[PDB]
From a paper:
Analogous to characteristic antimicrobial polymorphic toxins of Gram-negative bacteria, the LXG proteins consist of a conserved N-terminal domain (LXG), a middle domain of variable length, and a C-terminal variable toxin domain. The genome of SiB196 encodes two additional LXG proteins, which we named TelA and [name]. We discovered that [name], a protein lacking characterized homologs, adopts a previously unobserved fold and catalyzes degradation of the cell wall precursor molecule lipid II.
To gain further insight into [name] function, we determined the crystal structure of TelCtox to 2.0 Å resolution. The structure of TelCtox represents a new fold; it is comprised of distinct and largely α-helical N- and C-terminal lobes. This region contains a calcium ion bound to several residues that comprise the conserved aspartate-rich motif. The substrates may be inaccessible or [name] could be inactive in the cytoplasm. Analysis of the reaction products showed that TelCtox cleaves lipid II – severing the molecule at the phosphoester linkage to undecaprenyl. Our experiments showed that TelCtox is capable of hydrolyzing cleaved undecaprenyl derivatives but displays a strict requirement for the pyrophosphate group, indicating the potential for [name] to simultaneously disrupt two critical Gram-positive cell wall polymers.
Numbering used by the authors: 212 to 416, 435 to 550
Amino acid sequence: AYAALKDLTLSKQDKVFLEHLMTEYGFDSTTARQILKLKQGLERKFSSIFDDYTQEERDYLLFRIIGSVSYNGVKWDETAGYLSRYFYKEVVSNPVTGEKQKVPKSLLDIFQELGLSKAEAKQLQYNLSLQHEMAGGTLSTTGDMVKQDPDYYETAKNSYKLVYGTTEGFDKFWDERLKAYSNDGRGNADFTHQSITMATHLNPTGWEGDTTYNANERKPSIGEDDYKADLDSVNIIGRMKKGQSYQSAMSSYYSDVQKGHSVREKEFLKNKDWEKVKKTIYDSLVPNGINKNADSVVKDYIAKNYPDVSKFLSRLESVAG
Ligand SMILES: [Ca+2]
Ligand SMILES: [Ca+2]
Ligand SMILES: [Ca+2]
């Protein structure tokens, strides 16, 4: 655990970054180092010294690629941007003409272009999806899965063998990852959710989608994993806009979160007006028959019908004063 990061052969800044990935989301050193490998591939592919790209574009690409594990399809391409603009293979499309066409690269092929081996790419994708599904603390140990949903258990087991090549150790692995990714059931930030939120905010062309009736999703849904992801997206993007890279801003932010008190909520309320947040959620969730000025009535309505959004409001209200 501690023993893994002594030798390495990473800058002090990179080790700090790896440790934040591990602490905040639950990744072990193996997965965290694979995420660092992706980032290093982006710097080799999109230079600011030998080419034209910027650090913010490289940070966007990292968020966009990690997000695509869980958020894909044309609805997300229009929203967070098309990865095919940056990752493709060209093939002769008409043998007589010589005309070529650019064929979009799959997510696993993007991972390998950026430096991961085929096995590393499969492991990274799997662990990013696991963290995404487990972060909210709604999933079960294999021991409870067997009894409750035996078909989900054998499905999950098959996915693990697909990745690692064996069924051996699935129960121990799943239970170990469930404790780490879910923060022992209490909730960690949903990393792919945070990533696609940040990618969307950095696309040249979050909490609001999760707290309102937007079309696409399951209505409002803001479990603890999305609460942290949504607020941390806004906070870290804000630090980046002030001049920091993603690695610097997230390192400074998670350090500050540890050193302070309710820093996640206080910093969110400095980026987003508490009254605008309240108003956005009220207009979307509260029917016109309820006087929105009668704040005690509204809070009891939300508390009864949207317990997750209620906690979201209670936590911010608490720090708004
Ligand atoms: Ca989530
Ligand atoms: Ca402000
Ligand atoms: Ca209801």
